[PDB]
């Protein structure tokens, strides 16, 4: 049933069963300094970032290296650009980066209090200033997050500046899987902006479907990072379950000494302004703003055996957990095989095996349908067309689809069948004839 071949895994081997020393558990943060852009467009750094052995990466002083203008992202510039833009606010209590405490501050705990509000960039930029104001007068916090640069109109010069980036860091690249979904998934293939005051905290998580993440500190203020290799993710999960916080949907701040006691190595590093953090596929992380700063982040799937697997594992994992994979993987794999060539021998062979199963399933789902006497219509495809999801379970639907009215809905077989037992009142369609898929399959081969 699975779309992956375990025998094909490009994952590293960390069968490590020996308590690593203290120097191991506080391992040095992989880091790169960019003299010149020539460096930036080098393949060597691409190698580095994608290396499955490097869960996180900080390129140093990258911005000034490409001469990227971060004033475009300054809070002053954003207010002019859009003053009334909506931003969601997360209210929290200001604490030190490694600690999360109970209200009485007696003991330390995983679950992270977070409370949503909304406001305008306008007012919030005001708060960011009125906060820094009193800090001066001296010598509970609000956090702006999930602000869309998606609109290419008012954000135009903004988005036209991160085109200076190497191909693999860009929001849209023919070599970026998020680019083959064929529609917008916000803050992944769009740019999200964060405006912070000191102690602004993002709790533990992984990127959607294990996609790599690019993050650039606008500055001035520093951002403190913590991260853990994708390998340990399910044991961290185990902590959340224990503490009654949802791993995937929940807001949690890890207790480091818990992780250390788990023989779990932790990267911390500081991100200064102009520094680009690259989160590799799979890496559990959480962040805290030591300063006043703005940050910018979007998601990038590279094309690598590693990225693809982890994307697809999480995908199968979400079906199982009954969470929605924000990326329509089977749609993407097909959309890619067709558009893009492939050098990478493991990557190739992985998408191919996935496609085969994608193809094998339709052939079954159809076969059980046709002997069930169901009429299967063919509806072709429009250009610029979205992937499909069930209405109830939110699982991805590809190829054959189940439609209902009152204006139209799409279901998977199970959720459909439940509704109507004989698929009565349901119209089964095929977006792809069996030959269509058949040819596109062997049309897919290996590029030098």
Q: How far is CA 118 from CA 91, 201, 302, in A?
A: 10, 17, 33
Give the distance, in angstroms, between the CA of residue 210 and the centroid of all CA atoms in the same chain.
Answer: 6
Residue 87 found at the interface with ligand OGA (CB under 6 A)? no
Please report, to the nearest 10 degrees, the dihedral formed by the alpha carbons of residues 316, 430, 441, 362 taken in order.
Answer: 50
How many residues touch ligand OGA (CB under 6 A)?
Answer: 9
Nearer to ligand OGA, 96 or 414 (CB): 96
In whole angstroms, the minimum distance from the beta carbon of 426 to Zn ion comes to 12
* Contact indicator for 210, 285 with CB cutoff of 8 Å: no
Residue 228 found at the interface with Zn ion (CB under 5 A)? no
Nearer to ligand OGA, 222 or 396 (CB): 222
The single-letter DSSP state of residue 169 is G
State yes or no: 229 annotated in a binding site.
no
Interaction partner, residue 159 (Zn ion, ligand OGA, none; CB < 5-8 Å by kind): none
State yes or no: 240 annotated in a binding site.
no
Nearer to ligand OGA, 264 or 281 (CB): 281
427-430 and 376-378 beta bridge pairing: parallel
Residue 279 found at the interface with ligand OGA (CB under 6 A)? yes
Vertex 222, ends 165 and 144: CA angle to 5°? 85
How many residues touch Zn ion (CB under 5 A)?
Answer: 5
Nearer to ligand OGA, 81 or 284 (CB): 284
| β partners of residue 192 | 148, 297
Residue 171 found at the interface with ligand OGA (CB under 6 A)? no
State yes or no: 361 annotated in a binding site.
no
The single-letter DSSP state of residue 110 is S
Q: Which of 277, 412, 423, 426 forms a contact with Zn ion (CB under 5 A)? A: 412
Round to whole Å and give the CA distance between 143 and 260: 29
Residue 401 found at the interface with Zn ion (CB under 5 A)? no
In whole angstroms, the minimum distance from the beta carbon of 420 to Zn ion comes to 13
Where are the extended beta strands (E) located within 25-114?
31-33, 56-60, 86-92
The single-letter DSSP state of residue 59 is E
Residue 207 found at the interface with ligand OGA (CB under 6 A)? yes
Nearer to ligand OGA, 45 or 297 (CB): 297
State yes or no: 362 annotated in a binding site.
no
In whole angstroms, the minimum distance from the beta carbon of 353 to Zn ion comes to 25
Round to whole Å and give the CA distance between 274 and 68: 9
State yes or no: 390 annotated in a binding site.
yes
Residue 355 found at the interface with ligand OGA (CB under 6 A)? no
- Phi then psi for residue 25, to 5 deg, are -75, -10
The tokens describing 212, both together, are 């790599």
Interaction partner, residue 412 (Zn ion, ligand OGA, none; CB < 5-8 Å by kind): Zn ion
Q: Which of 82, 179, 295, 325 forms a contact with ligand OGA (CB under 6 A)? A: 295
In whole angstroms, the minimum distance from the beta carbon of 41 to ligand OGA comes to 22
Residue 202 found at the interface with ligand OGA (CB under 6 A)? yes
Round to whole Å and give the CA distance between 189 and 174: 12
| Span interacting with ligand OGA, options 56-64, 207-215, 429-437, 440-448, rule CB under 6 A | 207-215
Interaction partner, residue 50 (Zn ion, ligand OGA, none; CB < 5-8 Å by kind): none
Nearer to Zn ion, 56 or 327 (CB): 327
Residue 300 found at the interface with ligand OGA (CB under 6 A)? no
Residue 213 found at the interface with ligand OGA (CB under 6 A)? yes
If we measure between CA atoms, which residue out of 285, 282, 261 comes closest to residue 271? 285
Exposed / middle / buried, residue 182 (Cβ in 10 Å: 0-12, 13-18, 19+)? middle
Residue 186 found at the interface with Zn ion (CB under 5 A)? no
Residue 206 found at the interface with ligand OGA (CB under 6 A)? no
Round to whole Å and give the CA distance between 100 and 107: 9
In whole angstroms, the minimum distance from the beta carbon of 69 to ligand OGA comes to 19
**CB neighbour burial string for 189-226, b if at least 16 within 10 angstroms, e if fewer:** bbbbbbbbbbbbbbbbbbbbbbbbbbbbbbbebbbbbb
Q: Which residues bind Zn ion (CB under 5 A)?
A: 390, 392-393, 412, 415
Q: Which residues bind ligand OGA (CB under 6 A)?
A: 194, 202, 207, 213, 215, 279, 287, 295, 297
Q: Which residues are annotated as a binding site for Zn(2+)?
A: 390, 393, 412, 415
């Amino acid at each position: 049933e699975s779309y992956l071949s375990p025998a094909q895994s490009v994952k590293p081997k960390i069968n490590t069963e020996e308590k690593l020393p203290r120097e191991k558990l506080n391992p040095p943060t992989p880091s790169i300094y960019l003299e010149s852009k020539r460096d930036a467009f080098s393949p060597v750094l691409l190698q580095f970032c994608t290396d499955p052995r490097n869960p996180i990466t900080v390129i140093r002083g990258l911005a000034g290296s490409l001469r990227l203008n971060l004033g475009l992202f300054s809070t002053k510039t954003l207010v002019e650009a859009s003053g009334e833009h909506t931003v969601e606010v997360r209210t929290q209590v200001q604490q030190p980066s490694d600690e999360n405490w109970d209200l009485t501050g007696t003991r330390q705990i995983w679950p992270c209090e977070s409370s949503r509000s909304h406001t305008t960039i306008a007012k919030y930029a005001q708060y960011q200033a009125s906060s820094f104001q009193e800090s001066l007068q001296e010598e509970i916090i609000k956090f702006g997050t999930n602000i869309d640069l998606s609109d290419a109109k008012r954000w135009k010069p903004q988005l036209q500046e991160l085109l200076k980036l190497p191909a693999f860091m860009r929001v849209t690249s023919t070599g970026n899987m998020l680019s083959h979904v064929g529609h917008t998934i916000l803050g992944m293939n769009t740019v999200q902006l964060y405006m912070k005051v000191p102690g602004s905290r993002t709790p533990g998580h992984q990127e959607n479907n294990n996609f790599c993440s690019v993050n650039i500190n606008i500055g001035p203020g520093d951002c403190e990072w913590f991260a853990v290799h994708e390998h340990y993710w399910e044991t961290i999960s185990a902590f959340c379950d224990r503490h009654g916080v949802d791993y995937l949907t929940g807001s949690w701040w890890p207790i480091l000494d818990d992780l250390y006691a788990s023989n779990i190595p932790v990267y911390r590093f500081v991100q200064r302004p102009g520094d680009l953090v690259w989160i590799n596929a799979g890496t559990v992380h959480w962040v805290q703003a030591t300063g006043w700063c703005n940050n910018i982040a979007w998601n990038v799937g590279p094309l690598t055996a590693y990225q693809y697997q982890l994307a697809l594992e999480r995908y199968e994992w979400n079906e199982v957990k009954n969470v929605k994979s924000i990326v329509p993987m089977i749609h993407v794999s097909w959309n890619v095989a067709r558009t893009v060539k492939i050098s990478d021998p493991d990557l190739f062979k992985m998408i191919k095996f996935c496609l085969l199963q994608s193809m094998k399933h339709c052939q079954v789902q159809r076969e059980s349908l046709v002997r069930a006497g169901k009429k299967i219509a063919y509806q072709g495809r429009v250009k610029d067309e979205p992937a499909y999801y069930c209405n109830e379970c939110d699982v991805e639907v590809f190829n054959i689809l189940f439609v209902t009215s009152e204006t139209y809905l799409v279901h998977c077989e199970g959720c459909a069948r439940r509704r109507s037992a004989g698929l009565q009142g349901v119209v089964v369609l095929e977006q792809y004839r069996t030959e269509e898929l058949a040819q596109a399959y062997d049309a897919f081969t290996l590029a030098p």
